[PDB]
Design a protein around this motif. Sequence first.
Motif: not given
Ligand SMILES: [Fe+3]
Lengths: 131, 131, 131, 131
Positions: B16-18, B50-52, B117-119
């Motif tokens: 999902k992060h790409v 919290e997460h975005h 949170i996932h760099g």
């Molecule tokens: Fe993330």
Amino acid sequence: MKLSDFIKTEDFKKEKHVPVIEAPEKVKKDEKVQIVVTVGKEIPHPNTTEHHIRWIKVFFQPDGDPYVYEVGRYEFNAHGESVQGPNIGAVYTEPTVTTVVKLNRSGTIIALSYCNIHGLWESSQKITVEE
Amino acid sequence: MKLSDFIKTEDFKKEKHVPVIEAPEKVKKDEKVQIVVTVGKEIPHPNTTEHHIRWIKVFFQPDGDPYVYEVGRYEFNAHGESVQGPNIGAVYTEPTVTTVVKLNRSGTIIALSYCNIHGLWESSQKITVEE
Amino acid sequence: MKLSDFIKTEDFKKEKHVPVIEAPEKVKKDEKVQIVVTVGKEIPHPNTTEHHIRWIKVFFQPDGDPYVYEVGRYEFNAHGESVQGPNIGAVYTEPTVTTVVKLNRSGTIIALSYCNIHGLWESSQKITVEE
Amino acid sequence: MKLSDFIKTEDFKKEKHVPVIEAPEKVKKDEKVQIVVTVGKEIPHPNTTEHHIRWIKVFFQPDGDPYVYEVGRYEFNAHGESVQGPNIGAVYTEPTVTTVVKLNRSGTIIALSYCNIHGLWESSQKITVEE
Ligand SMILES: [Fe+3]
Ligand SMILES: [Fe+3]
Ligand SMILES: [Fe+3]
Ligand SMILES: [Fe+3]
């Protein structure tokens, strides 16, 4: 001195610097909404190393709330600069942006833009969100 | 330690992060080019307080040049925060952006995105410009 | 193409573009920590309308964690531009910043800086935090 | 609606959100000037994942000029977020910044700051520059 003494409004049909908002009048709750903001929409603005639009930011003001919320800041950071000289580089970023929001209450979209030599400019538009 | 030890690549069909680039393969010299970059393109990414995803930035690397040039930084700054509590605010900004460039030499478009949170994550795509 | 093919390191005693970190070696848990980052620390860098450092950003990499975290992005946005001409405006922003963090685990500080014509540069420094 | 309907002023001795400027009253032409801007200067402001100051930006308004100039935007981007949960991450960025400018005409420094849930705040201070 207040910042808003230096934030200008104008008619985009007369003034190249006005950031022009394109967004729907009414949307469903939580649906994705396209907001386009363009400087130099009708009257072109330069994009040279010496003179260019730096950014657009968008705020959302929910009806009945005390505050604004920064939707985003969108920076246009290439203006033809290069080691070989100003205005002969490979890339320019135009002051046009499309951002996508999900809204769950009605409010006002506010666009603020900044020229590197002509300061700050704004516009705004109401948006109605289904309850 | 180098930053690129912490910039990840992956297949957007699996991760999902790409940040996924949509841009034409070939363009005319100096013509306006639409570049769309989206995180959570195929696999959705959360957008909570919290997460975005915080931002996407785009670089242009001209063929044969030593450097990259920052086309822009595009910040997504609303994530449901409010005085009344996290995740009950009026507005969310999705990690989707369309930016417009004028190119006069061929090069590579590089997208870099950042999750709170996932760099860091990247992708890249060649673009050919008429001579 | 990976972005890190275009992020350069060097010795600040030889290369004006290197962002130089000043931070304590060891700090107490949760105490406020001053981090100074300067480009052109020993060897001066220009700050003209045509050629200037645009920004420094700082990342923190916690030991044993998969990711980096963006501590901040610090933009230097005045470079002598004006209606009256380039390089005769009233104000310049130098590429020096002091940011303050509170850390609760040991890690690595990474500085990334960007010149409008000489691309990206980095440096890094370990910081130990009391347990 | 104008943005300045949503930019608040207040006394920093009564209101945690006011950005407080520290800068000399008078400086020499072209000399490096330290400008410190702090939110939560006297009355502390939270820095949690849910509630935090996002940024400070600084403008310079030269006396007799029509415009403002963005000195910089300084983002504070770590607020304890992590995969392991909100408010247990390794790093927080406090809303304190020191930026360095060179001025060649007298003017006004304007600080604008943004809280993720309490909107926009400003303050300003004159600075005299030797002729
Ligand atoms: Fe993330
Ligand atoms: Fe202009
Ligand atoms: Fe340079
Ligand atoms: Fe607040």
